[PDB]
């Protein structure tokens, strides 16, 4: 039980982690798939 | 005594299952169909130029 | 529960990411097939004009 309640904190907090590089690391892709869009919707 | 959801859990983890698998299928639909159309046709209109 | 509600916070966007590469691959195809039928017309159009 308190094995599997510090996996589910530490997993939580490690998933909020790796969703942030993937939207702030580098351009970010949320930024060159705005720049690819916007190219065909041109 | 809190309770983690089990249920939430699984359906979640299925439901990323799912994401990874939809991207596995449009990656490799691009990769069979798209791409495989797209190379023909350009190698086929330079061999008649 | 604020671990819970930040994971799905989390989860949502990468939804989210996923979401927006099927539309812009969409959008790629269906100008990839548009532009093709404004090629061929014009092929058709200027065969017509010899007739005169």
């Given at each position: 039980e308190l094995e599997s309640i510090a996996q589910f904190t530490e997993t939580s907090e490690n998933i909020v982690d790796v969703v942030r590089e993937r939207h702030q690391?580098?351009?970010?892709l949320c930024e060159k798939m705005k720049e690819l869009r916007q190219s065909y919707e041109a | 005594g809190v309770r983690l959801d089990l249920q939430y859990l699984h359906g979640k983890a299925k439901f990323e299952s799912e994401v990874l698998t939809r991207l596995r299928n449009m990656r490799h639909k691009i990769k069979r169909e798209d791409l495989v159309s797209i190379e023909k046709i350009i190698a086929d209109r330079e061999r008649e130029w | 529960p604020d671990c819970a509600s930040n994971m799905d916070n989390a989860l949502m966007r990468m939804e989210s990411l996923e979401a927006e590469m099927e539309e812009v691959t969409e959008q790629i195809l269906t100008w990839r097939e548009q532009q093709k039928t404004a090629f061929q017309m014009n092929s058709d159009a200027n065969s017509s004009c010899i007739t005169a």
């Open positions: 690391s580098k351009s970010t | - | -």
